[PDB]
Design a protein around this ligand. Sequence first.
Ligand SMILES: [Cl-]
Ligand SMILES: [Cl-]
Ligand code: NA
Length: 129
Amino acid sequence: KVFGRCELAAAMKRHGLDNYRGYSLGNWVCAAKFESNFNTQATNRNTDGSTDYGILQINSRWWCNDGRTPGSRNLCNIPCSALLSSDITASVNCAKKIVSDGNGMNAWVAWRNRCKGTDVQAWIRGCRL
Ligand SMILES: [Cl-]
Ligand SMILES: [Cl-]
Ligand code: NA
């Protein structure tokens, strides 16, 4: 499923991401835009053989099991395929654990390089929330 920008903002808000760990909703929408282009089915393979899954491109090296990242962990206790659902609950619940691990949203490279220090509120402007 490819979310609209306001559609995704409303779903993230319902799932508790607005101001979660001090990150306003615009940060989460901005990160999803540049990580996956709002596409829940996005996958990308990393150099170390791990793979990023879903609308927030969560890495199998640490966070989910795809059966093909040797020595990896599964800290969100989910199959990586669950991160590709049209239902974003699994992605949100896992992202909540990631952003709480000490490094905030710096875990997402696209957020650090393209969202951090910008007017992220522009990503939710005009949306009914
Ligand atoms: Cl915002
Ligand atoms: Cl980047
Ligand atoms: Na894993």
